[PDB]
Ligand binder design. Structure first.
Ligand code: SRL
Length: 287
């Protein structure tokens, strides 16, 4: 069994998740959609083409009336068309990041951290928590993220893109709500995010959540078979941290030739004292 302390830790994370995770995406509205339409710079485009060609999805929008709009992205031709779903993606991700910021704020341990640590933790973990929330609505039989009335369907080769292989693998583990939120807490409270000051306090908080997840697993799962689930999960978090760095770099390359990030993404991801360079995040954190 878990200590009362560990049960309380889980309760608070579960509370936080239920209050901030719009699982049916019923409040995701007013987003943009794809419309009805040099030596060194080429090197930039060529990396960008690679950065994107692997992550293509068609988009489906189910209307309340039973109607269906389906969008199939264009093949990579000359150039620009490759960025067609980016403004919509920016909107979905920004929407997701806002729920991630609210999640963090409801957690006492996060709130007790100095504001500048809260900012640094949110910048380092944002993409990771968003992807962890996305895995819970990912349908691995169809290669589709089911987002309420919206759906994103991936257009042996997939398993080659680290983030796609990550969704498949994570999904296979058949985690409980509790395990997903403990994964989120562990990712959130990473002592080694750049610019974190209270390294020791964050490191200890992270070990607490990891121990709770470890005990949760010992106690809630048939022994022998789930003997290494915790470590499998820790390995997935290590790989996710690396995918985060990789994807942040792609984001910056695309932004360089085709600025498109929302103002909140610009703050989260280092796009153009710590509180002055992060006023949106700061305002979201203090309300
Ligand atoms: C670092 C910021 O990353 P980012 O939030 O930026 C959104 C504009 C981002 C988000 C993202 C990534 C994936 C993959 C990787 C699993 C395919 C998704 O499937 C989805 C949806 C919404 C369709 C579920 C969103 P990116 O990894 O994928 C964009 C297609 O962007 C990388 C630049």
């Amino acid at each position: 069994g878990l200590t009362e302390e560990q049960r309380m830790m889980i309760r608070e994370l579960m509370d936080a998740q239920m209050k901030t995770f719009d699982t049916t995406f019923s409040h995701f509205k007013n987003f943009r959609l794809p419309g009805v339409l040099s030596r060194e710079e080429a090197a930039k485009w060529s990396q960008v083409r690679k950065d994107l060609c692997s992550l293509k999805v068609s988009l489906q929008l189910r209307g309340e009336d039973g109607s269906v709009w389906n969008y199939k992205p264009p093949a990579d031709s000359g150039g620009k068309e490759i960025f067609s779903l980016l403004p919509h993606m920016a909107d979905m991700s920004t929407y997701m990041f806002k729920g991630i910021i609210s999640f963090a704020k409801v957690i006492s341990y996060f709130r007790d951290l100095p504001i500048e640590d809260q900012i640094s933790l949110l910048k380092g973990a944002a993409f990771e928590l968003c992807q962890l929330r996305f895995n819970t609505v990912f349908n691995a039989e169809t290669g589709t993220w089911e987002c309420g009335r919206l759906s994103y369907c991936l257009e042996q080769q997939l398993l080659l893109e680290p983030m796609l292989k990550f969704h498949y693998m994570l999904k296979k583990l058949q985690l409980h709500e509790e395990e997903y939120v403990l994964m989120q807490a562990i990712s959130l409270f990473s002592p080694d995010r750049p610019g974190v000051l209270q390294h020791r306090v964050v490191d200890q908080l992270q070990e607490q959540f990891a121990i709770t997840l470890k005990s949760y697993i010992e106690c809630n799962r048939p022994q022998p078979a789930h003997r290494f689930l915790f470590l499998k999960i820790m390995a997935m978090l290590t790989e996710l941290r690396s995918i985060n760095a990789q994807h942040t770099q792609r984001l910056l390359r695309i932004q360089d030739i085709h600025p498109f990030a929302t103002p909140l993404m610009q703050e989260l991801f280092g796009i153009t004292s710590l509180t002055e360079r992060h006023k949106i995040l700061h305002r979201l954190l203090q309300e």
